[PDB]
Amino acid sequence: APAAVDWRARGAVTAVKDQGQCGSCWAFSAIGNVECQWFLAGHPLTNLSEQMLVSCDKTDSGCSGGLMNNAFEWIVQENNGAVYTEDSYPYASGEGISPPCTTSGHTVGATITGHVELPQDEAQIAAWLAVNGPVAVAVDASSWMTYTGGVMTSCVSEQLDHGVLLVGYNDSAAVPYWIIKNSWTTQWGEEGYIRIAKGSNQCLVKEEASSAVVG
Ligand SMILES: C[C@@H](/C=C/C(=O)C=O)NC(=O)[C@@H](Cc1ccccc1)NC(=O)OCc1ccccc1
Numbered sequence: 261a262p263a264a265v266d267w268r269a270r271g272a273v274t275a276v277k278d279q280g281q282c283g284s285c286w287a288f289s290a291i292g293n294v295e296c297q298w299f300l301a302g303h304p305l306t307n308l309s310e311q312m313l314v315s316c317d318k319t320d321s322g323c324s325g326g327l328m329n330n331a332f333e334w335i336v337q338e339n340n341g342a343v344y345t346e347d348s349y350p351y352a353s354g355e356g357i358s359p360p361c362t363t364s365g366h367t368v369g370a371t372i373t374g375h376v377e378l379p380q381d382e383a384q385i386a387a388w389l390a391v392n393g394p395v396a397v398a399v400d401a402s403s404w405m406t407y408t409g410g411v412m413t414s415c416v417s418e419q420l421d422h423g424v425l426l427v428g429y430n431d432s433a434a435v436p437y438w439i440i441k442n443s444w445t446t447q448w449g450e451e452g453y454i455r456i457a458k459g460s461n462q463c464l465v466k467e468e469a470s471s472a473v474v475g
Pocket residue numbers: 282283284285286319320321324325326327328398399401420421422423468
């Protein structure tokens with residue numbers, strides 16, 4: 261693999277967003293991966309809609325939870341591959357209550373044709389990411405409310421409970437790390453990002469990695 265990749269340097273990652281009090285991390289994980297994957301297919305970077313998934317994806321549980329994988333499939337299977345612009349379908353669940361789904365008034369800002377699930381092995385995730393772009397991962401985020409910056413080297417690794425977006429890694433640093441886009445505003449961590457040590461399954465990062473595939 262290359263020694264270091266950071267997809268933010270390529271103009272491929274949109275701004276840090278804010279899930280608020282809704283348990284919608286899954287939606288932010290998956291839509292973040294679709295924004296990136298769409299850019300990489302040769303389109304302008306477009307902000308896309310989590311509210312679409314939170315409100316309309318009935319194969320997931322709204323502000324109670326969901327799986328990035330079900331979100332991918334619901335897009336392809338039930339919404340004709342369409343992902344709405346964030347503009348045409350703004351986030352309205354900051355309070356922990358999602359409104360009812362609306363099937364009109366929106367504009368398509370990306371489409372996808374499916375998703376891949378990556379192996380449970382950090383070296384192999386990194387290989388895939390190096391080439392194909394940012395990846396949705398699940399993590400144990402228990403530790404993460406105390407996080408203020410730097411590379412974290414000890415992470416409570418017991419149960420997956422949060423969905424985030426893996427955007428780069430650096431193997432040449434004193435402690436190899438992953439670069440992870442979180443959805444708790446820019447007020448948290450490194451301007452909305454976290455860096456966690458790579459190679460030791462910090463936060464169970466290898467366990468549930470996957471990506472949308474665009475046309
Ligand atoms: C509550 C929410 C985000 C929460 C936070 O903001 C907590 O920090 N977590 C989730 O939605 C996800 C995180 C996750 C994603 C992928 C694999 C493993 C876990 N948790 C989650 O529990 O999904 C449950 C579920 C399963 C099937 C159908 C509906 C719901």
